[model samples]
Target: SRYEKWEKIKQHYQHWSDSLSEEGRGLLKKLQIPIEPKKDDIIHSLSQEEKELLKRIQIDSSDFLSTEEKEFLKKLQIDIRDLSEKEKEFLKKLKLDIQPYDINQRLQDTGGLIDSPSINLDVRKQYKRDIQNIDALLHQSIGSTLYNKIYLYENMNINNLTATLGADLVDSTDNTKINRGIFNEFKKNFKYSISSNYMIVDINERPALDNERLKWRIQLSPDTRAGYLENGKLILQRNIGLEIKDVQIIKQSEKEYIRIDAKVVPKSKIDTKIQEAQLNINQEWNKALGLPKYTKLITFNVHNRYASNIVESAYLILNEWKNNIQSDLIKKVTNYLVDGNGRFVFTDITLPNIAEQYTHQDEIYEQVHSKGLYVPESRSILLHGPSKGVELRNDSEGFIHEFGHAVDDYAGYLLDKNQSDLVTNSKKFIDIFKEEGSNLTSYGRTNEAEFFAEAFRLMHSTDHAERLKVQKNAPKTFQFINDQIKFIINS
Candidate 1:
C-alpha cells in the first residue's frame, strides 16, 4: 500500500520531472523519500543535526554517573521512528505531509548565512553573534539538565558515582562556573532569537487550491521559504511570517494535484503592545480610583453567529483607537468583555424586541438607528446587522458610545460603597445637572450613569465647543470625569 501511494505521488509529478535535464534528474533522484520503518527499527534514520545531538549525548556521558545516570540517559533516548509515525498521522489529519531533503545540503535557503560573502558586513557579523548565541543556549540547556538530573539523583541517595562531589562543590567547578555565568545570557538570547523569533511561522505542507490547469499550489512562495531557511543554513531564519489558509486538490479523472492559499504578515505587535497597555491602565486606575482587573475577557455567541469578515470589521474598529489615553482604558474594559478571539458579542432577537429595546428606536428607524446593544452589567457590547449607523457616527463613534458604557460600568465600582454619601455630599454636582436640565443629550436624562456615559461619549467623540459647553454647564461632573482621566493616565 505504501509503495502504491509512492508511485501515485511520483506519477502526479511526472510531467514536471520530464522537463528536467539529466543533472536535474539525478538531483531529483536524491529527493529523500519517506522510508517505511521495519518492525525491528527502534529509531529510524536521523538527519545530520539529530545524529550530532545523539553523538553529543554519548560524548558527555562521562559528566553523568555510571549506573542511575546511565539508566536515565538510556531512558532519554527517544525512538525517532515511533515519533515520526505519530507526526505523519498528525499531518495526515490536516491533509498534509513532509518530504525530507538532502541532509548534507540545505533543505531551503534562508536569506544568507553568517559566513555568506553577499551579506552586508555588519549584518553578517550580527548573524555570527546570533549563531553563537544559539550555540550557547543549546549548551546551557544540555549542561543544566545534566547538573539538575545528577543533583536530583544524589538527593535521592541513588547516585552511584564514587567521585560524587557535593552539589555546592559541583557548582564551584570551572565548567559549572562558565555555565552559570552565561545562564542568564542564554535565557535572554534564546527566548528572543529562538523561542520568539525562530520558526515562529511554518510552511504548512498541504495543497491549497486548484485551477483548470490540473496543478496545486503550496502555502508559501519559494522566496519566502528561502528567506526563512536562508543561504544553505539548516536554521529556520526569521523575519516576517506565513500561514496557509486553505488547500485544494485538482482532479482530472485519474490524476490529482495540490494547491494552497497563504498570506505573510509581520509578527503581530498587538499581544505585547496591548497587553502592556492593559497592565498600565489597571495599575493607574486601581491606584487612583481603586478599580481592578477582571479575571477573564468574556465572549458570547458573536464569533459563531457572524461571518469572520463582519467580526473582523469590529476588530479593525477597535484598532483605530490604538496609542491614545483611552486606548488602554478601552482595552482594559473591553479585554474583560471581548471574546477570546477578540470578537464582540452578538445577540439574536426578534425584529420588534430589537427595535423597541436594544435598538432604542421604532421599527422603521432600524434602517437608520443603532444596530448594537451595550449591556453594561454583563460587560458586553453586541453587534447587529446593517451597520449604517456606525458609518454615520464617524465609522467608529457607535462603538465608542458603547465603550463609554463599559468604562462607566467598571469605573462605576468606585461609587458603589459611598453611593449615598457621594450623592448626598455632592448635591452641587446633581444641581448642576438639574439646572442644565436638558443641555446634555435627551438620552442622558435617563439616569446618572447615562449622564456620565453620555458626557464621556461627547468628550471623546465630539468637537471642542460641545465639550466646553458640557463642562461649563456641569462643572462638578466634568471635574469628576477629569479626575477619571487623570486616574487612567497619571495615577
Candidate 2:
C-alpha cells in the first residue's frame, strides 16, 4: 500500500514538474522542487554543500568536517531503506519540496502516451491555461519584479508561487485553498510593532523553526491533522516562507559555541500539527467535561505551545463556578445565556483580528488589552491563554471578570424577558455608576458594565479583603449585585 500510494503520488505530480522548460526547471530549482523520491534518489539530489547536510545526517565524504563531526553525522545517519514507512513518506515529501516543479508537470494533462513526446506540448498548454486563469507567480516575473516590487529572491518567491500553483492544488488538509483567505487577513491586519508584540503572539514569540517535532522526523505527519486553528498560522522568518532545514553551530572562540537547528516546512504541514493537537485535546476535554451541554469550551495555538493552562483554569473556574454558585443561576443561564448557549474560546494571541474569527462582534482591537474578553453579541468569552511571565495572576481572575460580564449579559437577557433590558442597564444599576462607581479599580472606569464586573469580581473574590474592599468603597453596587443574585434565584 505504501508503494502503491507512493506511485499514485508520483503520477499525481508527474506532469506538474516535467512541463517546465529546461531553463524554467533550472529557475524553478531556486524554489523547492516537487518530486517523487526514494532515499537514494534524494541522496543523489544533494550537492557538496547539500550532501554534507542531507537531512542533517551529513553522509557525503568531505575533508572539512572533523573526525568528531564525521562520527556525529554517521551516528545520526540511517540508511534510506531503514526508515519507517511514515518516515519515508515525510522524506519523500521533503524531497518533493526540495526539488523544483517540472514545467510540463504544472502544464500537462494526462492523455494517450502522455510521456510520448515527453509531454513537451504540455508546456504550451500550460501557457494557454495561464492565459485562461490569467495568473501564476512565476509566470509573469517582470510584473511581479517591477510592478509589484516582488523581487526575485524574497517572500514573493514562495508566496506568489504557491498561491498561483496551489490555487488549484488539492486541499491537503484544510478547507481553503492555500489557507490564504486566512493568511491574507492575517497579514493584512496582524502587523506587529517594535512594541505591540504583546498585542499578538501572547507568549514569548517562540518563532523557533520546525517546532521541535522535527527531531522526531516522524511524529508529525499527514495523519497528525485534526486542529490549533491558531498554531496553523504560517510563520514568516524575516519574511522567508520556504526556509531550509539545517543545524548550525557557531563557535565563538574555542570555548563558547551556540547551536541552532532550524526547520522549514510548508504552511499546510504546520496546519497538520495544529489540527492534530486540536483533535487530541478536544477529545480529552470532551471526556472530562461533556462539552455539548455546556456549549463548547475551545482552545487554540496556546495548547501546543504553552500546554493546557486554558483547560486547567477552565476546570478551576467552571467547576469552582459550580462548587459555589447557586445551581439556580446555571439553570437560568442554561435557559438564557451560557451553559446551553454560550462558548468559551482561548487564543494564543495571534496577529489576528478577532472580528475576523468572531463575526458576531463589532469591537475595536485597539481597546482590548485584557488576557480575557467576553463578547456579548456572540455570547462567547475569549481568553488569551498565556506562558509564564505573561501571566499576572492566573486565568481564574480573568475568567471571573469575563464571567461577571456574562452575568451582566445573562441578567440583561432575563430582565428584558421579565420587564426588559440587562441587569446593568436597569434603572437601579445606572445611578449606582452615575456617581464614583470607578472605585473598584481603574479598569472598571472604562464603562458602567466594567464597573459592575469589578465589584462583582471583588464580592465574589476568595479573599475577604477583596470582598470587604468592594463593600467599603461601593456599598450600593455591592448591595445591587447581592440583590441580582436574589433576583436570579427567585425568578
Candidate 3:
C-alpha cells in the first residue's frame, strides 16, 4: 500500500518534469526517497540547556515538604557537632544551614557515606541557583515582548511608562536580597463604523489609545509552567514589568469605556511568543515523564483534534469530514463555481487553478513570498508544489488559501455589481493592514487582499485549533473575517 502511494507521488513529478524547469529538478536532486518519515525520527532529545533546567526545578520540591517536616529534617540533621575541616568546607558550599556532630551520633543513626547530609544539601543549592538563572532569563524574554506590546498601544509619550521590579516576592529570592520585577481600535475598528455598523472612530492616538475607563487588569500569575520545569514541575511566571490583553470599543449612548474582566483569570497569557515556548518545554517534559509532546502547531493532522496540541480547529472553517477528503473551504469554492448556472460570472481565463511560470517571481516577489497567487484581473489562482520555491508553504494550506482569495473577490461581486473591491479598498482595512503588520501571518503582511484571504483561511479552517489561532494571534483579523462572514451569510 505504501509503495503505491509513494510511486504515485513520484509519478506526478515525472509528468511535470517533462515540461519542467531546471530549478524544480534541483530541489529533488538530493531528496531522500527511502525514508518516508519513520515513526521514531520525530522523537527528539532535549538540548544541554534543557538538561540543566531539569536539575534545577527540584527547588519547588521544597514546597511539597511540609514546614513541620522541613523543621523535623532540620532538627534531625543539626544534632551533629564534631566535624572535619574538609566536611566543614563542603557544608559551607552546601549552605544547608545544618551543622555536623561527632561520628558517634552518626553511628547511632542509620548511615551510609554516599547518603551524607551535604549530598542532599548540594541538591538544594542547585535548585535555588537554577531559579536565579531563570529569574533573569525570564527578564529578557518577557521584558522585551512587554516593551513591544506596550509600544503597540502607546504613542509618543513613551517617557511616562517606566520599567520596574516587583515589590512583593512571589519574591522567592535570596531572603538576603531577593526581588521581583516586572489598544488601539484600529482599521477593523473603522469597519466597526463600516458595514459592521459598530462605530468608535475619532481614535485619540494623538497621544495614545489611552482611555479613562479602560481597566489595566495586568496580572502576574503562578502559571506552573512559565520559567522552569514541570515543577509541583513547571515554573511559569508573568513579566512583573509587562501586561497584555485585548480591548473592545463599546459605547453607551456616546462614551462607553472599560481589565476591560478581572475576577477569575488573575492571568492573561495571550500571544504565541510565550505559549509556544511553553509548549516546547512541556512537550519535552511530557516525553520525559512518558507523556505526549503536544498538548502542537501546524494546520494539517486531523488527528490534532484530540491531541494535546489544542490545534487550529479553534481556527474554524466548515467542520472537517472524514469519508470525503475535501475541506469545507474547498467545497465552498467549487459550489460557487458549479453554480455558474447563475449570475456572477468570474471564472479566470488563462489558468483555472493551474501553476503559471515566471510570473509569480515578479514585482510582488521583491518583497512578498507567495506560495500561490490570485490574480483579480484574470480571476485566477496559481498553484505551485512545495519544491516550487526555496521556501514554500504547506501544500494543503496553499490550496485553501488561494481559494480564499478567489472567494474574497467573488463575495464582493456577489453582493453588488458596483464596489467590486469593498473589503480591502476602504481606508478601514488599510489602516488595519498598517498597524497589524507582521502581527498577522507574515505572508498576509503583503497586502490587504492577501491579509483578508490569510485571515479567511485560518478562521474558516476545518481545524478548531487553527481558528483559535486567528482569534488568539490576530484578534482584529479574526473579527474582521467574523463580521465579513456574518454579513455575507446574513445577507
Top candidate when judged by lDDT against the true structure: 2
TM-score of each: 0.31, 0.43, 0.29
Candidate 3 structure quality by residue, lDDT tens digits, 1-491 = 43343343234234433643454233222121211222122112323453343233332233223343345434333322112333323323222223232221121121111122222445435433433443343321223222122111112111111001112211245322212121231111111000000011111122224313332222222221122111011122321123223434434334333212111122222223234534554454334333333522112211100111112211221122111123343434434433332111111111211213223323211211133566555444443221121122233455466666766766666567465764666676778777674675766675688788777766655577877987887787777666655555554
Better of 2 and 3 by lDDT: 2
Off by over 4 Å in 2: 1-304, 311-313, 338-340, 350-352, 355-357, 362-369, 387-392, 418-420
The clash count of every prediction, one per candidate, is 17, 27, 48
lDDT of 2 at 303: 16
The number of residue pairs in model 2 that clash at the backbone is: 27
lDDT of 1 by residue, 73-176 (tens): 34434433222333323222211111112211121122122242322345446545644443332211112212122110000110110011112211244421
Write the number of the candidate with greater TM-score, choosing between 1 and 3: 1
Candidate 2 residue lDDT tens string, 276-317 = 655665565555544443234454433122222333444455
Q: Best to worst by TM-score, what's the order?
A: 2, 1, 3
Candidates ranked by lDDT:
2, 1, 3
Model-by-model lDDT, in order? 0.36, 0.42, 0.34
